[PDB]
Amino acid sequence: RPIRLLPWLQVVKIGGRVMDRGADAILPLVEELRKLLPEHRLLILTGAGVRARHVFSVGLDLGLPVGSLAPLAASEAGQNGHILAAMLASEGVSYVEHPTVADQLAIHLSATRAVVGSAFPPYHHHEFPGSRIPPHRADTGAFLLADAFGAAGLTIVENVDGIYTADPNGPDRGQARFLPETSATDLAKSEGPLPVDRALLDVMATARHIERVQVVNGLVPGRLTAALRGEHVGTLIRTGVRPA
Amino acid sequence: RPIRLLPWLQVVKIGGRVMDRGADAILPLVEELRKLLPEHRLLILTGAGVRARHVFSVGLDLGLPVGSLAPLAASEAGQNGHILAAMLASEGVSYVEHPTVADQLAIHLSATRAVVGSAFPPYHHHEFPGSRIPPHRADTGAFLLADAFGAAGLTIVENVDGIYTADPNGPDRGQARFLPETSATDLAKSEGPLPVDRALLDVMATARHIERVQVVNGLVPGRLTAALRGEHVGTLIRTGVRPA
Amino acid sequence: RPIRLLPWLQVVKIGGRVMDRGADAILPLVEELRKLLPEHRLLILTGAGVRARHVFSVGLDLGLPVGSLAPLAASEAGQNGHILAAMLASEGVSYVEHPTVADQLAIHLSATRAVVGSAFPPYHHHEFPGSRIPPHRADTGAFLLADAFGAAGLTIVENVDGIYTADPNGPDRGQARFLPETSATDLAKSEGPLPVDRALLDVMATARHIERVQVVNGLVPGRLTAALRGEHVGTLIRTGVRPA
Amino acid sequence: STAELEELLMQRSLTDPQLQAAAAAAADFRILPDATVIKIGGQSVIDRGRAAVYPLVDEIVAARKNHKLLIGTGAGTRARHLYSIAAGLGLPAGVLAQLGSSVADQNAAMLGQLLAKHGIPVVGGAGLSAVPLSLAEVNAVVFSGMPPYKLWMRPAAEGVIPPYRTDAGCFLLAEQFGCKQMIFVKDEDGLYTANPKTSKDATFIPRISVDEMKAKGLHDSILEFPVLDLLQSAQHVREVQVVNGLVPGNLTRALAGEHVGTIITAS
Amino acid sequence: STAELEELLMQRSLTDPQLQAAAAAAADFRILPDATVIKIGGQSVIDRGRAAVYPLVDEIVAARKNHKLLIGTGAGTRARHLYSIAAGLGLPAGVLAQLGSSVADQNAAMLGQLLAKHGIPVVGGAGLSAVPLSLAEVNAVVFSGMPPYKLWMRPAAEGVIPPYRTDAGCFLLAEQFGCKQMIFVKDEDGLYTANPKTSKDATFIPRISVDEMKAKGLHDSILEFPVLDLLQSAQHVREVQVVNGLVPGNLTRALAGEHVGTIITAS
Amino acid sequence: STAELEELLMQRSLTDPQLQAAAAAAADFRILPDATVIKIGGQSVIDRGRAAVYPLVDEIVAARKNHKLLIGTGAGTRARHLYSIAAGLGLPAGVLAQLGSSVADQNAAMLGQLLAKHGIPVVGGAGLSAVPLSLAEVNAVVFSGMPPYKLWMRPAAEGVIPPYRTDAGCFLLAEQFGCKQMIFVKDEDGLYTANPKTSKDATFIPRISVDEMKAKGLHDSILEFPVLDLLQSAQHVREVQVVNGLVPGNLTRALAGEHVGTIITAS
Ligand SMILES: Nc1ncnc2c1ncn2[C@@H]1O[C@H](COP(=O)(O)OP(=O)(O)OP(=O)(O)O)[C@@H](O)[C@H]1O
Ligand SMILES: Nc1ncnc2c1ncn2[C@@H]1O[C@H](COP(=O)(O)OP(=O)(O)OP(=O)(O)O)[C@@H](O)[C@H]1O
Ligand SMILES: Nc1ncnc2c1ncn2[C@@H]1O[C@H](COP(=O)(O)OP(=O)(O)OP(=O)(O)O)[C@@H](O)[C@H]1O
Ligand SMILES: [Mg+2]
Ligand SMILES: [Mg+2]
Ligand SMILES: [Mg+2]
Ligand SMILES: [Mo]
Ligand SMILES: [Mo]
Ligand SMILES: [Mo]
Ligand SMILES: [Mo]
Ligand SMILES: [Mo]
Ligand SMILES: [Mo]
Ligand SMILES: [Mo]
Ligand SMILES: [Mo]
Ligand SMILES: [Mo]
Ligand SMILES: [Mo]
Ligand SMILES: [Mo]
Ligand SMILES: [Mo]
Ligand SMILES: [Mo]
Ligand SMILES: [Mo]
Ligand SMILES: [Mo]
Ligand SMILES: [Mo]
Ligand SMILES: [Mo]
Ligand SMILES: [Mo]
Ligand SMILES: [Mo]
Ligand SMILES: [Mo]
Ligand SMILES: [Mo]
Ligand SMILES: [Mo]
Ligand SMILES: [Mo]
Ligand SMILES: [Mo]
Ligand SMILES: [Mo]
Ligand SMILES: [Mo]
Ligand SMILES: [Mo]
Ligand SMILES: [Mo]
Ligand SMILES: [Mo]
Ligand SMILES: [Mo]
Ligand SMILES: [Mo]
Ligand SMILES: [Mo]
Ligand SMILES: [Mo]
Ligand SMILES: [Mo]
Ligand SMILES: [Mo]
Ligand SMILES: [Mo]
Ligand SMILES: [Mo]
Ligand SMILES: [Mo]
Ligand SMILES: [Mo]
Ligand SMILES: [Mo]
Ligand SMILES: [Mo]
Ligand SMILES: [Mo]
Ligand SMILES: [Mo]
Ligand SMILES: [Mo]
Ligand SMILES: [Mo]
Ligand SMILES: [Mo]
Ligand SMILES: [Mo]
Ligand SMILES: [Mo]
Ligand SMILES: [Mo]
Ligand SMILES: [Mo]
Ligand SMILES: [Mo]
Ligand SMILES: [Mo]
Ligand SMILES: [Mo]
Ligand SMILES: [Mo]
Ligand SMILES: [Mo]
Ligand SMILES: [Mo]
Ligand SMILES: [Mo]
Ligand SMILES: [Mo]
Ligand SMILES: [Mo]
Ligand SMILES: [Mo]
């Protein structure tokens, strides 16, 4: 088994659609994050949200390949990260670039309590072919990092309570049953949309350290605080990493 | 009104002509800065001084436009910043680049008590046309940053006591009356030279947070210490930002 | 005499051949380094080792000049530094790049107790001609930095006890007598191999601050701890800088 | 002569009127005098996708055979979304300026990938991209139109929207490099007395000076209003042309000297 | 049409099968359709020094007169040494991936210095290195073959060796830029039924599909096994050719359409 | 053969005389054999402004038609001002070296802006700037002449002035890239027995070896004295030429093989 590089680290991924709600959603989340700073050492990673859909719409209309779209969407996650970091600047928090996250996170988390980065992985023009939509997005990037570091946890902060049997905002609203607990293998066998990347389920299958990931609703204050303490307030996804 | 990003920050701009005096002026200033480190969180920004005049002389002789001269002068302010930072290295102070000041100042001021940067703004080849001399120089850059961050203050450290009615080292020496207090609007209506950029007066008119700026003599030990405590030891420039 | 920029700094250079031994040598060294973190402020610099010999073998076979080989070997020292930094990441230690070591070491050592860098100096394509083997390697780079900063000390960590009269792993094994103490001038007049760069002896002749350098065996736990406390556990090289 | 200027540069403050007058007498060197700067609108063109971009790519490829081009990109709707999120949080103009740059970079990347097979690169430092601009096989570069001000952006009198965006960014580059022409490629034929999307009896204006535009109090958001003040202070580019990029061959016609669209003059 | 896709992109999750099906109907643009990507093996070629590299440099210089080339480098024995040191410490695949990149960069630097006098640069961003690829005097670029994943490298099912190395790095670049050909330059004539360095009666395979290779359970480490899965999902590069770079003129012959070596097809 | 060298490289220390002797037998590859390196003096030329720079720009533009040029810039009076401020504070040579680099970069930027319309770029990595050096339309690059040593600058025996400045920086580049010629463009006709600005009966020296210069104890600060020792150890550039750039056509004449100025030989 590989060693844990930063065993004391907590990684939090904030969905781009949470950021897309603006001040109504960001201000209570910022206030909750401020209160968490003295409790944990955090790597906060942001997703892309709706602006990545607009750039996919233009990019696909121009016929651009999947490797062209990947860095364009990643830029949106980076911009959400600069917005979130600016809101926490007075607390000593800043946005750090991917090379800094990859090689110097330890020194940055010694200087301050949290840093913000883009959750997108730097696959760029070397994105895998197959789909016209880049498969390695924000949930996948956040998990790859969390598992590579051997982090204490990974929490995914969404605009929904967790994973449902169908899209709770889609045509099948009435058939959507909440799943309090699931496994990566069980979700992989399912058809239908998910609020997490499908590639996340693939990387969870080969995970070395992270045993569970929780998907929580960032629109309900207190849920992120509770999830970071291990409380069951959303959907728990078991990765298939067996403990001792 | 925009929010204050770093409300606890004190910005100090050291004139390039103060640095041009060498060890006789720099060593007492360094000693005074060392004593200030435990008292404030400082962003120290350096001006350009005489070497920018030499590069303007060569550059104008070659017929180069204003956007060509701006980064050439900025380099001189950067070099003064490396000299000042080296003198304070034993105290944990270093020079930080413009991208770091713009996006990561909070983390750097969490690690250490002060950092040094170039006061010149990165207008570069996108400098405004009109004059053959770049208008957005060190005083302007320091103010734009101080006001964007919502800093607790901005102090300008010069080789003179403050602003006079005429150049106290110029032909009209005898007509030069010291101004203890003035406003950006009053100075803007005046003709004649100033020890501050004319563009500073324009940006002070649209300021969002900084109510006053003090110009002090860095050649008199103790004045910078006093100015940072709000004592009236030079010229106070009111910006026209009205308080509550 | 130039001023000491970081008088409280201890510089340690770890030989690339120590790293080449892998886990058997690295794990006890990492454990000893962990225990040293609360005692000293360290700049840890890594050498290149055997992989630089392989790239010299390929590079010389292609007829490449000395300035082409220098950055190729330096890359190996950089890779050893990333490996060592990853082992100490949980303690707040990271690898920092040459521009960061040159201009921002003070801030990085204020955030954390130690940083790792490549011991190779950035001579690159401007390496001196004369030999087909780059003369300014890891020992030389570590010394140039230690002396430029006015560091409290420089310790060289090798896979041997110190300097012998002949290579203790070479054909003349039986004629190899251990030297507990020597001077840069005495070693310079000698023919035969050394476990330190010949260029190190040249830069020691013009040194401004470092009076002595100790070469210790990193394969014997405790020797690095003892050397950092000034104990005589290897070869002491006097530089010819006379004290007060 | 240069002897008086050098003496004044050493002894006087840079704010001194005597020094300012002497510096104004210096020779004027044009760095890239044969180049034309074009701005491809973000919201007006690139955001419209294939139907707007593909015909313009063909015009650019044909035009570079006879004209040296510096093609700047606008930002558009993704920047407006970032500006509304950030403005709602009370973030200052300086933060918004950095967010807007990312959108113009995305647009330059998409345009550059359609032009790569024709040898046209996406660059940083367009005005000094001496090699691509000197080759007949290339003769053009694509650049992101946002100015580099970032946190040092001069804010507007009110609000947090950066007042110097991609129209100002492209114009200042034309101005600094002493280019021969500045063309804004938008989605309207040019300037009208009233808004062409609002009013019914808005008349077309083929030519106007900045003074006349100010005096007539024009409600035309076709050009960033701070660009008009920059145009009045400009040393090299004393006129700009606004053309509709949605009309086939309009950019080709403008480069050929046809008076398509509106010409805005400094005086 | 594009109207349904834009509606789905806004309202559905990107994991939605309906959205995925609609995005698959989008037009297909090839960025660099006339280029050939070649991988020069690290262990198989560059590590062998002068005897292997010098003849290949001459073939590249001759070949670029008629073929646009993107030449990627492998890593080889110094990367294997780094991987064994790091694996022994229990460092994860993500750390090993960064170490491996340094070795491919060293190899690109050495190759670039032998090619500099012929005008061929070492670049970052090969696929978009529009200027060198558009000039008859240049028509080629050298790049480091390691993918940029670094710490975000997808690990293998077991062990810490990065599964996506320089074969995958060069292949994905050929695929993303829509190149016409992908040639792997190694030190074996091609694929054999058994290992050519181990078994005695291993038969040569001139052509095979990924499915047949999987079905026959081939013990040939000539190509990184994850490259075969990428090849099956590829949109642009549906076949690859493996040639022996130690045979004089083999790369020249492959570029001329000769069926030297083994052709591996997606289906 | 290479078999003995590879064995010695693995088993012996790099300081071993046997290894050093074997490495000296390796083949010698010249990276840019057809290029000429020129140093444009900072204090001697660029600091003089228009009267000195404009005629040299015209010579460079004319000369690049027939000669591949790498043009390095000196630093000059702004660097001397930085050195006196920093020396007075007791800052070490390593800090001064970084300050000096900024001045050489400013000079390269000014020269590059005058040359941009002729297609000549300012680069980083001149010796490997393969694309501009291979095109007849370009055939030249401008680079900053300061070496990259920064804090790792070898100090002089006494004082804090960096001993390796822009003469050494340009020379080492000529040497490393195996260039055919190295020309120093200064403001004196060449070397004299005594200082031409001090003594009255100083005689001109058209040709001299480094040994003779040392033996005659020359008081000529025309060339940085450490450059003379580098010249004696050089493998590729065994002679340098010092010319007066203030004399019209002197650089053109030197490139044509005329013996204008002084030739300094290694032996
Ligand atoms: N099975 C499902 N369970 C829950 N939500 C679902 C499901 N299928 C689809 N969704 C939808 O996914 C939405 C979340 O959108 P998405 O995951 O794309 O946003 P995000 O995570 O914020 O974006 P990003 O990945 O850029 O960070 C939910 O609001 C919900 O409508
Ligand atoms: N009205 C004035 N009141 C005071 N000083 C004036 C006035 N007009 C001109 N000056 C001159 O301005 C000088 C300060 O020079 P200047 O402001 O250019 O230097 P600096 O601020 O150190 O430079 P930099 O802007 O590069 O940091 C004073 O020494 C004084 O001679
Ligand atoms: N006189 C000598 N005394 C001691 N060791 C010697 C002597 N001459 C040669 N050596 C050899 O030098 C070896 C150390 O090798 P070397 O100095 O190249 O490695 P390193 O310092 O780890 O490498 P790097 O310089 O890349 O960090 C010793 O193991 C020993 O065999
Ligand atoms: Mg989601
Ligand atoms: Mg001033
Ligand atoms: Mg050694
Ligand atoms: Mo950065
Ligand atoms: Mo960075
Ligand atoms: Mo990087
Ligand atoms: Mo960096
Ligand atoms: Mo890099
Ligand atoms: Mo950085
Ligand atoms: Mo990219
Ligand atoms: Mo940096
Ligand atoms: Mo940076
Ligand atoms: Mo930047
Ligand atoms: Mo950076
Ligand atoms: Mo950047
Ligand atoms: Mo610039
Ligand atoms: Mo960096
Ligand atoms: Mo850096
Ligand atoms: Mo640098
Ligand atoms: Mo940097
Ligand atoms: Mo740099
Ligand atoms: Mo290099
Ligand atoms: Mo940037
Ligand atoms: Mo950028
Ligand atoms: Mo790009
Ligand atoms: Mo990109
Ligand atoms: Mo690019
Ligand atoms: Mo570029
Ligand atoms: Mo950049
Ligand atoms: Mo940039
Ligand atoms: Mo940049
Ligand atoms: Mo570049
Ligand atoms: Mo530039
Ligand atoms: Mo630049
Ligand atoms: Mo370029
Ligand atoms: Mo280029
Ligand atoms: Mo890198
Ligand atoms: Mo790199
Ligand atoms: Mo390179
Ligand atoms: Mo290199
Ligand atoms: Mo390079
Ligand atoms: Mo490049
Ligand atoms: Mo790079
Ligand atoms: Mo890179
Ligand atoms: Mo990079
Ligand atoms: Mo570049
Ligand atoms: Mo790129
Ligand atoms: Mo790029
Ligand atoms: Mo290039
Ligand atoms: Mo380039
Ligand atoms: Mo630099
Ligand atoms: Mo630089
Ligand atoms: Mo530049
Ligand atoms: Mo510049
Ligand atoms: Mo430049
Ligand atoms: Mo370049
Ligand atoms: Mo650079
Ligand atoms: Mo640089
Ligand atoms: Mo650099
Ligand atoms: Mo470049
Ligand atoms: Mo280079
Ligand atoms: Mo490079
Ligand atoms: Mo270039």
Numbering used by the authors:
A (entry chain A), B (entry chain A), C (entry chain A): 33 to 276
D (entry chain B), E (entry chain B), F (entry chain B): 4 to 270
Give the authors' words.
As opposed to cryo-crystallography, room-temperature X-ray structures reveal realistic conformational flexibility that is crucial for protein function. In conclusion, we show that SMX at synchrotrons allows fast, straightforward structure determination at room-temperature for large soluble macromolecular complexes as well as membrane proteins.
Room-temperature structure determination of this complex is challenging because of the unusually high metal content, which makes it susceptible to radiation damage. After embedding these crystals into LCP, we collected 68,788 indexable diffraction patterns in ~6 h with much less time necessary to collect a fully converged data set. The data extended to 1.7 Å resolution, and the resulting electron density map is of excellent quality. Clearly, high-resolution structure determination at room-temperature by SMX can be fast and straightforward.
